PDB file of all heavy atoms in Angstrom:
ATOM      1  N   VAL A  55      89.925  82.916  90.550  1.00 38.41           N
ATOM      2  CA  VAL A  55      89.889  83.095  89.058  1.00 38.41           C
ATOM      3  C   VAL A  55      90.889  82.303  88.356  1.00 38.41           C
ATOM      4  O   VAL A  55      92.086  82.474  88.623  1.00 38.41           O
ATOM      5  CB  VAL A  55      89.994  84.565  88.651  1.00 38.41           C
ATOM      6  CG1 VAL A  55      89.861  84.808  87.212  1.00 38.41           C
ATOM      7  CG2 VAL A  55      88.917  85.544  89.389  1.00 38.41           C
ATOM      8  N   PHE A  56      90.536  81.380  87.517  1.00 37.30           N
ATOM      9  CA  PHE A  56      91.384  80.464  86.866  1.00 37.30           C
ATOM     10  C   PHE A  56      91.576  80.947  85.394  1.00 37.30           C
ATOM     11  O   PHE A  56      90.585  81.150  84.696  1.00 37.30           O
ATOM     12  CB  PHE A  56      90.810  79.010  86.771  1.00 37.30           C
ATOM     13  CG  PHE A  56      90.585  78.406  88.142  1.00 37.30           C
ATOM     14  CD1 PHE A  56      89.284  78.495  88.735  1.00 37.30           C
ATOM     15  CD2 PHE A  56      91.582  77.786  88.927  1.00 37.30           C
ATOM     16  CE1 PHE A  56      89.025  77.913  90.019  1.00 37.30           C
ATOM     17  CE2 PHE A  56      91.323  77.205  90.070  1.00 37.30           C
ATOM     18  CZ  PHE A  56      90.131  77.302  90.663  1.00 37.30           C
ATOM     19  N   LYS A  57      92.856  81.077  85.068  1.00 37.72           N
ATOM     20  CA  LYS A  57      93.120  81.516  83.594  1.00 37.72           C
ATOM     21  C   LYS A  57      93.623  80.323  82.839  1.00 37.72           C
ATOM     22  O   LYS A  57      94.727  79.825  83.128  1.00 37.72           O
ATOM     23  CB  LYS A  57      94.163  82.642  83.592  1.00 37.72           C
ATOM     24  CG  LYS A  57      94.460  83.062  82.196  1.00 37.72           C
ATOM     25  CD  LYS A  57      95.538  84.278  82.319  1.00 37.72           C
ATOM     26  CE  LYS A  57      96.066  84.629  80.882  1.00 37.72           C
ATOM     27  NZ  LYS A  57      96.992  83.589  80.308  1.00 37.72           N
ATOM     28  N   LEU A  58      92.874  79.811  81.937  1.00 40.22           N
ATOM     29  CA  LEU A  58      93.194  78.660  81.141  1.00 40.22           C
ATOM     30  C   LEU A  58      94.064  79.102  79.914  1.00 40.22           C
ATOM     31  O   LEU A  58      94.239  80.303  79.785  1.00 40.22           O
ATOM     32  CB  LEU A  58      91.902  77.978  80.665  1.00 40.22           C
ATOM     33  CG  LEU A  58      90.909  77.596  81.748  1.00 40.22           C
ATOM     34  CD1 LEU A  58      89.749  76.734  81.243  1.00 40.22           C
ATOM     35  CD2 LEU A  58      91.594  76.967  83.000  1.00 40.22           C
ATOM     36  N   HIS A  59      94.469  78.120  79.118  1.00 38.45           N
ATOM     37  CA  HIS A  59      95.178  78.413  77.906  1.00 38.45           C
ATOM     38  C   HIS A  59      94.228  79.182  76.984  1.00 38.45           C
ATOM     39  O   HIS A  59      93.052  78.990  77.017  1.00 38.45           O
ATOM     40  CB  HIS A  59      95.578  77.050  77.250  1.00 38.45           C
ATOM     41  CG  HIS A  59      96.552  77.207  76.105  1.00 38.45           C
ATOM     42  ND1 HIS A  59      96.096  77.266  74.811  1.00 38.45           N
ATOM     43  CD2 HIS A  59      97.891  77.347  76.109  1.00 38.45           C
ATOM     44  CE1 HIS A  59      97.255  77.407  74.038  1.00 38.45           C
ATOM     45  NE2 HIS A  59      98.268  77.411  74.770  1.00 38.45           N
ATOM     46  N   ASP A  60      94.800  79.999  76.175  1.00 35.74           N
ATOM     47  CA  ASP A  60      93.976  80.945  75.345  1.00 35.74           C
ATOM     48  C   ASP A  60      93.133  80.226  74.193  1.00 35.74           C
ATOM     49  O   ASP A  60      92.150  80.726  73.735  1.00 35.74           O
ATOM     50  CB  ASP A  60      94.765  82.127  74.717  1.00 35.74           C
ATOM     51  CG  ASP A  60      95.994  81.649  73.858  1.00 35.74           C
ATOM     52  OD1 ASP A  60      95.899  80.603  73.090  1.00 35.74           O
ATOM     53  OD2 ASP A  60      97.025  82.350  73.955  1.00 35.74           O
ATOM     54  N   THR A  61      93.570  78.991  73.871  1.00 34.39           N
ATOM     55  CA  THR A  61      92.775  78.140  73.102  1.00 34.39           C
ATOM     56  C   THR A  61      91.463  77.666  73.607  1.00 34.39           C
ATOM     57  O   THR A  61      90.547  77.186  72.878  1.00 34.39           O
ATOM     58  CB  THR A  61      93.543  76.905  72.618  1.00 34.39           C
ATOM     59  OG1 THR A  61      93.914  76.101  73.727  1.00 34.39           O
ATOM     60  CG2 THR A  61      94.725  77.359  71.654  1.00 34.39           C
ATOM     61  N   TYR A  62      91.220  77.804  74.909  1.00 35.92           N
ATOM     62  CA  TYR A  62      89.979  77.521  75.499  1.00 35.92           C
ATOM     63  C   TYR A  62      89.015  78.735  75.280  1.00 35.92           C
ATOM     64  O   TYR A  62      89.460  79.863  75.367  1.00 35.92           O
ATOM     65  CB  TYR A  62      90.075  77.204  77.050  1.00 35.92           C
ATOM     66  CG  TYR A  62      90.552  75.767  77.301  1.00 35.92           C
ATOM     67  CD1 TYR A  62      91.766  75.322  76.865  1.00 35.92           C
ATOM     68  CD2 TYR A  62      89.584  74.878  77.684  1.00 35.92           C
ATOM     69  CE1 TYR A  62      92.146  74.033  76.944  1.00 35.92           C
ATOM     70  CE2 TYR A  62      90.009  73.486  77.805  1.00 35.92           C
ATOM     71  CZ  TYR A  62      91.277  73.043  77.457  1.00 35.92           C
ATOM     72  OH  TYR A  62      91.610  71.774  77.517  1.00 35.92           O
ATOM     73  N   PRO A  63      87.690  78.475  75.073  1.00 34.01           N
ATOM     74  CA  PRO A  63      86.765  79.577  75.002  1.00 34.01           C
ATOM     75  C   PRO A  63      86.688  80.228  76.315  1.00 34.01           C
ATOM     76  O   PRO A  63      86.674  79.612  77.398  1.00 34.01           O
ATOM     77  CB  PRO A  63      85.427  78.774  74.825  1.00 34.01           C
ATOM     78  CG  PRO A  63      85.722  77.362  74.466  1.00 34.01           C
ATOM     79  CD  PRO A  63      87.047  77.171  75.006  1.00 34.01           C
ATOM     80  N   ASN A  64      86.650  81.610  76.405  1.00 34.66           N
ATOM     81  CA  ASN A  64      86.477  82.338  77.657  1.00 34.66           C
ATOM     82  C   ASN A  64      87.477  81.901  78.710  1.00 34.66           C
ATOM     83  O   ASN A  64      86.957  81.478  79.753  1.00 34.66           O
ATOM     84  CB  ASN A  64      85.061  82.206  78.069  1.00 34.66           C
ATOM     85  CG  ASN A  64      84.030  82.584  77.027  1.00 34.66           C
ATOM     86  OD1 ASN A  64      83.062  81.863  76.772  1.00 34.66           O
ATOM     87  ND2 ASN A  64      84.228  83.680  76.337  1.00 34.66           N
ATOM     88  N   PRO A  65      88.756  81.888  78.461  1.00 31.22           N
ATOM     89  CA  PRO A  65      89.702  81.184  79.264  1.00 31.22           C
ATOM     90  C   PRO A  65      89.869  81.731  80.714  1.00 31.22           C
ATOM     91  O   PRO A  65      90.326  81.087  81.559  1.00 31.22           O
ATOM     92  CB  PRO A  65      91.054  81.388  78.521  1.00 31.22           C
ATOM     93  CG  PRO A  65      90.709  81.943  77.268  1.00 31.22           C
ATOM     94  CD  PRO A  65      89.419  82.586  77.375  1.00 31.22           C
ATOM     95  N   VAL A  66      89.320  82.995  80.958  1.00 34.31           N
ATOM     96  CA  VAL A  66      89.336  83.565  82.263  1.00 34.31           C
ATOM     97  C   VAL A  66      88.036  83.049  82.990  1.00 34.31           C
ATOM     98  O   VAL A  66      86.924  83.562  82.684  1.00 34.31           O
ATOM     99  CB  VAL A  66      89.499  85.004  82.374  1.00 34.31           C
ATOM    100  CG1 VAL A  66      89.420  85.472  83.800  1.00 34.31           C
ATOM    101  CG2 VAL A  66      90.875  85.388  81.784  1.00 34.31           C
ATOM    102  N   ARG A  67      88.075  82.086  83.919  1.00 32.88           N
ATOM    103  CA  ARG A  67      86.912  81.527  84.611  1.00 32.88           C
ATOM    104  C   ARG A  67      86.894  81.965  86.038  1.00 32.88           C
ATOM    105  O   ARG A  67      87.662  81.516  86.850  1.00 32.88           O
ATOM    106  CB  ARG A  67      86.926  80.046  84.414  1.00 32.88           C
ATOM    107  CG  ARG A  67      87.118  79.478  83.088  1.00 32.88           C
ATOM    108  CD  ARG A  67      85.828  79.414  82.191  1.00 32.88           C
ATOM    109  NE  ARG A  67      86.119  79.054  80.759  1.00 32.88           N
ATOM    110  CZ  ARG A  67      86.174  77.751  80.397  1.00 32.88           C
ATOM    111  NH1 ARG A  67      85.801  76.796  81.220  1.00 32.88           N
ATOM    112  NH2 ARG A  67      86.417  77.447  79.134  1.00 32.88           N
ATOM    113  N   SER A  68      85.862  82.799  86.460  1.00 29.67           N
ATOM    114  CA  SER A  68      85.731  83.287  87.755  1.00 29.67           C
ATOM    115  C   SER A  68      84.782  82.470  88.522  1.00 29.67           C
ATOM    116  O   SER A  68      83.647  82.354  88.243  1.00 29.67           O
ATOM    117  CB  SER A  68      85.386  84.762  87.670  1.00 29.67           C
ATOM    118  OG  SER A  68      85.229  85.250  88.991  1.00 29.67           O
ATOM    119  N   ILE A  69      85.258  81.913  89.672  1.00 30.18           N
ATOM    120  CA  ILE A  69      84.380  81.118  90.516  1.00 30.18           C
ATOM    121  C   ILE A  69      84.188  81.877  91.850  1.00 30.18           C
ATOM    122  O   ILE A  69      85.050  81.973  92.564  1.00 30.18           O
ATOM    123  CB  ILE A  69      84.984  79.726  90.821  1.00 30.18           C
ATOM    124  CG1 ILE A  69      85.434  78.938  89.681  1.00 30.18           C
ATOM    125  CG2 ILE A  69      84.046  78.859  91.682  1.00 30.18           C
ATOM    126  CD1 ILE A  69      84.329  78.673  88.654  1.00 30.18           C
ATOM    127  N   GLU A  70      82.951  82.324  92.084  1.00 27.81           N
ATOM    128  CA  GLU A  70      82.696  83.377  93.086  1.00 27.81           C
ATOM    129  C   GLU A  70      81.899  82.779  94.324  1.00 27.81           C
ATOM    130  O   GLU A  70      81.433  83.517  95.185  1.00 27.81           O
ATOM    131  CB  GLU A  70      81.921  84.528  92.474  1.00 27.81           C
ATOM    132  CG  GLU A  70      82.806  85.251  91.460  1.00 27.81           C
ATOM    133  CD  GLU A  70      82.052  86.569  90.882  1.00 27.81           C
ATOM    134  OE1 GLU A  70      81.951  87.491  91.663  1.00 27.81           O
ATOM    135  OE2 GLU A  70      81.645  86.521  89.741  1.00 27.81           O
TER     136      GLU A  70
END
Side-chain angles (χ1 to χ4, degrees):
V55 181
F56 300 98
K57 179 181 173 289
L58 307 188
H59 193 265
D60 57 40
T61 58
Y62 278 64
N64 309 130
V66 178
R67 309 279 176 86
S68 179
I69 308 298
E70 296 183 73

